[PDB]
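ok so heres the complex, two chains, lmk if somethin looks off
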Amino acid sequence: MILDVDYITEEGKPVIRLFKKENGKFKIEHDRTFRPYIYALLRDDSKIEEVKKITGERHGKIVRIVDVEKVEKKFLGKPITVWKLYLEHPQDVPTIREKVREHPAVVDIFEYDIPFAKRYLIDKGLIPMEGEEELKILAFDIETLYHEGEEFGKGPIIMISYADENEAKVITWKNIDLPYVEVVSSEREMIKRFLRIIREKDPDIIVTYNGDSFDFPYLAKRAEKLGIKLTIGRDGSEPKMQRIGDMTAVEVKGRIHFDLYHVITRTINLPTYTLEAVYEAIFGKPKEKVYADEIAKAWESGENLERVAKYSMEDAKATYELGKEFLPMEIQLSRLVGQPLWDVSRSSTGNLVEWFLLRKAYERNEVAPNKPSEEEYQRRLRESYTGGFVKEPEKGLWENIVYLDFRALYPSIIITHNVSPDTLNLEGCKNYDIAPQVGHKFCKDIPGFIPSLLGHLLEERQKIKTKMKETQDPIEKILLDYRQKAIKLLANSFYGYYGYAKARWYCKECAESVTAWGRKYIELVWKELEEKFGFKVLYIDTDGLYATIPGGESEEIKKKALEFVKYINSKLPGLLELEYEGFYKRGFFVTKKRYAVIDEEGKVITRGLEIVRRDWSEIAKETQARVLETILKHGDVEEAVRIVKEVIQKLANYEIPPEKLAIYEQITRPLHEYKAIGPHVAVAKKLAAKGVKIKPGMVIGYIVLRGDGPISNRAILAEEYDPKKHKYDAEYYIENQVLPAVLRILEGFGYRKEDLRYQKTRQVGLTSWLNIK
Amino acid sequence: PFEIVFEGAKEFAQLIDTASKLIDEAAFKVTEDGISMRAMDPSRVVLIDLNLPSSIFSKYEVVEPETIGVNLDHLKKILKRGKAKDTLILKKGEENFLEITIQGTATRTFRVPLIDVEEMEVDLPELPFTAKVVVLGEVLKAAVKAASLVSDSIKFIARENEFIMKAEGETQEVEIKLTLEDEGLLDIEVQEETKSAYGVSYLSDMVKGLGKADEVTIKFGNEMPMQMEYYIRDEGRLTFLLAPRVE
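and the predicted structre for the whole thing:
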């Protein structure tokens, strides 16, 4: 099983190496026979003579086109005759590229910016992570004293935790009596032990969570300051920096450094991406966090280091669990396109698609288009681009709502309407499919390059789903659930690739067409859903529609909704298909992208309403939830308002516990750098005078008080607050806390702040106590 | 046309000043029986009634009944010039204007233009109040200003031989209990416990121009309007009917 690929140089000759794990044994294969090459389209395939003589220089010698051969590949489907100009070394290519495309003999050149190791996998037909070799996974995390406004690498690395298939340890240089803590002599020794563990564990994949920017780099700094060689690579080499995308990653020559951050962050949205939050939002299980202030104190005054150590073994156990979690998919994905896990785990879906096409381009005899030129790329970034269709929602509260959505909408459209660059507006085709508004033409005679591949990807997926629900090997029934998910991810990525600025097979027309057709089928479904089955469409967004038969019975709706589906799928063309996706007892749609629904299991689903960020006190969070469940579970905005008013009142009559008033926030940096001085930032420097921690990494809880100046100068630590001595600013918690949280939901029903504010007495008119009035 | 004469232009001045902090214009009904003016504040929360029988003027000659609408602020300016022992003369003729003379050491005559004023016909109610109190302008002016620093509403509470005035602010509060022995309270007569709240801002304009020795009679009821009467020359009477703040 191929783990990764690279090449060293010997005698000025490339020596591609293959890092394999065949039968528990790490093996390195060398191949001094592959050769760099570019393609040249000669207008006169005879000028190849004075053209194969050009030469350049990079580090002395004069690079010579060590060969040429007239090959017959094809371009965008049409025939073409180019020349394969071999070179002795990869580096020689940038040299002669600048030239070769100068001599009027060439019309243009192709496949010239493709990395040697990558060109190898493709051409050699090799696909990574192919096979079923047991890979050794090892996760690791580091804890340091580093903060923010300080030198990166200056503060020592306090601990180094790691975990695997069966073990979770912590290495530190201060005593802690715990079966899982390995006490050691010094920081240097900690690093030594760590280097030893990987030597003994010998992992194929080293998992980290943001190890690319934090762990490894920080580790490097320390190793250096302490004069130690970081022999992590299976060849004794050190972790190396490697530019990828627009960032700087880290690799380990003989192993695969898998950094979860890139993978996670791009497959799940979240307010922030702390290890804690992620572990929580993936397993539900919570994970306690320990902060700067704590850690520094425990390390200084050697007391309490037990919990600061558990946090550490916790970090590793987490990173490992997440790794096993996300590794299966990324691996199958790496298998899917033909590139190394290291690369894939850090790539965008667009670059993931590009890689796929490049090898699918070579499998067929298709020459690849080039990346846009710097100016092309620029005026492309400037060009507007299409997005998901969204229907202004119908207002009010609705019951018995069904959600219908298209299955693989864009991929389906790309396939059934043969939307591809090579089929766009060809002439003399027996048949065409025409994009709804933009009127683009697509030849239906021969399957387009992309549509062909996408069609096969989807057929191959059903295959999976079939051989899946069948077999009785749960482990397999799992591995292939992954293989089908990887295909799902990859296919859903083609739509956006079409508009990916740096894409070779870029085609703005295809993009617009897919969108217009999306609109057409959405509107068609919408049309017949209301005009024939008597439904009322409540909200549409990109793929799905929400609907209901106003006033109708719950079972009638479920029955007819399903009747409509089978009915419309008969009329929909090609692979276009709608499905009865879900049902909701009740729900409401505020604005585009902002709504709330609830299933029969009582499970609430919401978008753009619920307040998250710690920026909100529990009184705000709690009430909003009271409001949301009363309306969704019982259907009455009226009892919801009643609730809000009662809470607003309690806030005013100082009847709410200080805890449901505390707002927490961490100090991002020194309190001398803060421009905008919020409450905590002020409770920070306020305690700073009182001489205390104030280390950029700790959270300051606060409570605003009934002062006179701005909030800031009036907040007391969430503890320096004591009743019968403190009067919190109820107005603040009412006007800037509870009302905003609750009005996102009640505003739509017609409610206003005036309607929810409180006041013991209200001025009344005299006129009713008057008679001739 | 008429000719009315009042002895003591300062006391009269103050009267108008008082019953004018809430209004800009007024129509005065001059009849053989006396002078009367009735109006409501712009918000229709306070009713102002002024009754001045002929009995309190040293000279009272009213040929033909008349109602003359005047701009109160303008009028106030003129009367502000009257001294304690100055005699006030009000002369109305055929022309559309009122002649005012502050007679004394610096005798001078001012001309005031008569404007039209929307005369909203409304009578003065006979409310079944349950509590009556007689207080001094001082205590009352104090409590109202005191309360205006903490709450926007002040609460009146009266039980037999006891009268309270309190208000709740965002941090601190105010409260004042009076009994027959505070002499800020000259008389008290309730029939049942009586509570009611009112707007500090309306009571403010109503007690603004009250001397410290001035005496006022307040009558109210639970969740009901409050009545305040100031007597002028014993028979003349200034009444305010103030809508309550209900909880």
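quick notes: The first strand of chain B starts at residue 2 and ends at 7. thats all i got rn
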